[PDB]
């Protein structure tokens, strides 16, 4: 499960193995993290411009 | 203190025995417990309270008075608001 080579989770509350083979991670949502990431960096730099006004 | 406790119990429990509702509201007389219940609008039927019935009626009334398109909000309506702001 640590390799992630078939995914799944192991339940010792009854003794089953659930085998989940469903897709992971939304690609679209994930690339939105790097885009926000870059906007959060830029605004510190815009604030360097605004030191001119002060 | 009782009236305060009776809002609480809706959230805490959905089944209580008749002895347990009495205990919790600091009573010692079963007839008084059932008396309060009429007035506080609880339906104790067969010695088990149905807090959930009561919630339904309470929610519905707050919808029932008009305010109501924008109170709810619509999927369609969000996009309309955002649209006009950009083209103004």
């Amino acid at each position: 499960i640590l390799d992630k080579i078939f995914y799944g989770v192991l339940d010792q509350g009854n003794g089953w193995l659930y085998v989940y083979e469903t897709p992971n991670q939304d690609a679209t949502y994930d690339s939105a993290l790097e885009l926000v990431g870059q906007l959060n960096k830029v605004v510190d730099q815009l604030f360097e411009k605004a030191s001119v006004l002060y | 203190i009782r009236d305060e406790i009776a809002k609480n119990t809706e959230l805490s429990y959905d089944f209580l025995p008749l002895s347990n509702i009495k205990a919790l509201l600091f009573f010692n007389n079963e007839k008084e417990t059932e008396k309060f219940a009429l007035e506080r609008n609880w339906p104790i039927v067969n010695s088990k309270v149905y807090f959930n019935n009561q919630s339904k009626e309470k929610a519905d009334y707050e919808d029932e008075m008009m305010h109501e398109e924008d109170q709810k909000t619509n999927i369609i309506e969000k996009a309309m608001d955002y649209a006009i702001s950009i083209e103004n």
């Binding site: - | 119990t9 025995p17 955002y82």
Partner: protein, 237 residues
């Protein structure tokens, strides 16, 4: 019944105004609105030692506000400020509330009594002896999903199964604990399991974020072009 100006006044007035509101709102047991108003007063007010006594009082009130919520300020805050000695009664409070210690809490407000009352946050502070308990039982329900009535009484020195039943009954009307009591088995069970992405709740949040942004466009538009218009009229080219 105020109709206070914002577009034509000095920023010193605008800070002072925001400060007053949080104090008055807080005393009426509205800590939600209290919290928004103080952060705005701080941003208006500078970082200098010219404003120094203003900032000290404003930042006292902000720590206390977040404790009254059960929000709790971070450890970051007190360290990165260089105000450590002044905010010392609040610091001890923040550690105290978190731990859920009634025993510690009794010590904290007693030790520091005088310093707190001069700031007139002492009136607010006494209300935390209760919130200290509510935070504490919230710890217990996170650590243990399903937890006996007896176990809780043992950790925080609560008096009966029946007593703790009742503490939790008040606390979950306010939805702090976010749990429900089963009388018929004898446990307190938190009900959170997430998967609220599926639900319409995030949609509601995203809608609010956009409108805070559309409003920022308006501030930008009115300000930007207005001193340009003056300079053209002016004899300078």
């Amino acid at each position: 019944k105020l109709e206070y100006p914002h577009t034509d006044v000095s920023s010193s007035l605008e800070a002072r105004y925001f400060f007053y509101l949080s104090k008055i709102n807080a005393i009426q047991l509205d800590y939600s609105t209290a919290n928004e108003y103080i952060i705005a007063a701080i941003r208006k007010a500078p970082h200098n030692s010219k404003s120094l006594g203003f900032l000290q009082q404003s930042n006292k009130l902000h720590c206390c506000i977040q404790l009254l919520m059960g929000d709790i300020p971070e450890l970051s805050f007190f360290h990165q400020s260089n105000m450590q000695k002044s905010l010392l009664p609040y610091y001890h409070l923040t550690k105290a509330v978190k731990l859920g210690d009634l025993k510690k809490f009794t010590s904290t407000i007693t030790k520091y009594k005088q310093l707190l009352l001069k700031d007139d946050t002492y009136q607010l502070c006494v209300r935390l002896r209760s919130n200290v308990i509510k935070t504490g039982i919230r710890i217990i329900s996170l650590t243990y999903k399903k937890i006996s009535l007896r176990d809780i009484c043992l950790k925080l020195n609560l008096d009966s199964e029946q007593t703790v039943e009742y503490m939790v009954s008040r606390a979950i009307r306010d939805g702090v604990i976010e749990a429900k009591i089963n009388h018929e088995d004898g446990f307190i069970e938190t009900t959170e399991l997430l998967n609220i992405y599926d639900s319409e709740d995030p949609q509601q949040v995203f809608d609010e974020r956009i409108k805070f942004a559309n409003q920022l466009h308006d501030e930008y538009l009115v300000s930007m072009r207005y001193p340009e218009d003056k300079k053209t009229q002016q004899n300078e080219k």
